[PDB]
Structure formats: structure tokens, C-alpha cells
Amino acid sequence: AFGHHVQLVNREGKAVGFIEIKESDDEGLDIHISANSLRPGASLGFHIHEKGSCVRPDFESAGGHFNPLNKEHGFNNPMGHHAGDLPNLEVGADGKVDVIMNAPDTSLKKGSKLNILDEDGSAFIIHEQADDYLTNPSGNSGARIVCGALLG
């Protein structure tokens, strides 16, 4: 079943949706994201960062793409992808996105290195532009515009 509810907040700390997580059949994790107040018809970058902490306005604070296996950024990068790299989100006419994505290289299991549940927590971030699955460290996805901290 889905759980570990995470609330999503924008630059101004307004609630703009939520995330929940399922230990996947199969395998790794499934991420249910349901958001609003986003740039309509946009394609928007989206990653798991290494610090469960969401400080306005900019969310630097932190990280850090979740990168326990110390690779570079991007699906299409031969040296790359960060365990926390996820596909771009597609926004409805709406301004809303409501999907389940699989993060195959993540975990909640204790003693797991891919464990995104840990002392520090992890944070889910939606970026301002679309990700190019290639450029370090960011895929040129731009500013951090939405954040959600996972602890527990």
C-alpha cells in the first residue's frame, strides 16, 4: 500500500499537493505525485535530493541529488545517473500533475545504501524547466520550485 505521506510546498510555502510511496512490486520504489499551481502544458524537471529539508525560498537547503553510488547526472549520460534522478513531469492544461513514477534505485529498507529513508531524510524537488537527462549536475532544469521532505 502507498504511505509515507509527504506534503509539497512551493517557493512561498503554499501547499500545492502531496507525494506518497510504495515499496515496489517490482522493484525499488513507486512514487505517487499529485500537484497543482504548476506551469500549464510544461515539461518540468523532478528529482530526489539527499537532505530531507525544505527551506524557502530556494530549497538549496539541501541537497544534492540523491547519489549513493557516486555517478553523474542523467539517464542519457554514460557516466550517469544519480539514484535520485526521475523522469520529467508533464503538466495538464490544468496546472496539475497526477501520476505514479517508479524510482528503481531507491529503498526504505534499513541498512540499504539506496535507502532514501535514513538519518538525514531525502527531499523531492520539482524544477522550473525540463531536464535534458544529460548535463551535470542539474540537466539544466533550472531553479528549485517545489519541495517535499521525507523523514521517519
What part of residues 123-142 is at the interface with Cu ion (CB under 5 A)?
A: 125
Stretch near Cu ion under the rule CB under 5 A, chosen from 5-13, 28-36, 97-105, 117-125:
117-125
How many Cβ atoms from other residues are within 10 Å of residue 59's Cβ? 25
Q: Which residues contact 55 (CB under 8 A, 6 or more apart)?
A: 61
Q: Determine the Cα–Cα distance for residues 4 and 85; give it in Å rounded to an integer.
A: 20
Among 105, 106, 117, 150, binds Zn ion (CB under 5 A): 105
Please check if 47 is assigned to a binding site.
Answer: yes
Among 73, 91, 114, 125, binds Zn ion (CB under 5 A): 73
Please check if 4 is assigned to a binding site.
Answer: no
Q: How far is CA 56 from CA 22, 60, 102, 145, 146, in A?
A: 28, 9, 28, 10, 10
Are 65 and 50 in contact by the 8 Å Cβ rule? The answer is yes
Which amino acid makes up residue 131?
A: D
Question: What is the binding site for a copy of itself (CB under 8 A)?
Answer: 1-2, 22, 24-26, 32, 34, 98-102
Q: How far is the CB of 127 from Zn ion (least distance, A)?
A: 10
Select 42 or 62, whichever has its Cβ closest to Zn ion: 62
List, as residue ranges, the binding site for Zn(2+). Answer: 32, 98
User: By the criterion CB under 5 A, which residues form the site for Zn ion?
Assistant: 34, 65, 73, 82, 85, 98, 105, 118, 120
